[PDB]
Amino acid sequence: HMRIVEEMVGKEVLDSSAKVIGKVKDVEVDIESQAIESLVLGKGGGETIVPYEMVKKIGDKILLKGPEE
Amino acid sequence: HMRIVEEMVGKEVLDSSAKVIGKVKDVEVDIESQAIESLVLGKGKGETIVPYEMVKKIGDKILLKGPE
């Protein structure tokens, strides 16, 4: 249960290497399943689309999983 | 497929009786099931929580409820 705008947005996404890929710009949703399918991140100064199946944890920051994870 | 914040936050949501319940200020998702919970409407400070269940269509506006 999370507020996309007020919460899960503007949130930094880190890859498994503790690097920051960017922040959450929006969230692509599949119209059918009414389900999430990917996060659209922002560079800053243009967009990166990361599959939601990559997200490992979502707390203060969003942690993507490793290649072996 | 449909981007959320972009093409869905801000749009007005209308009744079955073509009435304006409010505008979508936010949307909640069940980060586990990967499902959109409901829409959070700006008012008529206060908030209305429309079970995303209903939503019949999304165009320049959001249409909902019916005979079900």
How far does A7 lie from chain B, in Å, by closest CA?
A: 10
Asked if B1 and A34 come within 8 Å (Cβ–Cβ), the reply is no
Q: How far apart are CA B21 and CA B48, in angstroms?
A: 8
| Backbone φ, ψ for residue B49 (5° rounding) | -115, 95
Type of residue numbered A55: V
| Backbone φ, ψ for residue A54 (5° rounding) | -95, -35
Task: Specify the experimental method.
Answer: X-ray
If residue B25 lies in a helix (H) or strand (E), which one and from where to where? strand B20-30
Task: Tell which residue, B53, B63, B31, has the closest CA to residue A4.
Answer: B31
Give me the total of CB pairs closer than 8 Å, taking one residue from chain A and one from chain B: 67
Q: Collect all residues with Cβ–Cβ distance below 8 Å to A41 and sequence separation of at least 6.
A: A13, A21, A22, A23, A24, A25, A47, A48, A49, A50
Give, in order, the Cα–Cα distances in Å from B27 to each of A22, B47, B55: 22, 12, 13
The DSSP symbol for A54 reads G
Kindly list the structural domains of chain A, giving each domain's residue range(s) and its CATH number in brackets, ordered by start: 1-69 (2.30.30.240)
Cβ atoms of A3 and B28 closer than 8 Å: yes
- 3-class DSSP string for B8-52: CCCCEEECCCCCEEEEEEEEEEECCCCEEEEEEECCCCCCEEEEC
Q: How far apart are CA B26 and CA B13, in angstroms?
A: 12
The DSSP symbol for B54 reads S
How far does A42 lie from chain B, in Å, by closest CA?
A: 14
Q: How far apart are CA A49 and CA A46, in angstroms?
A: 10
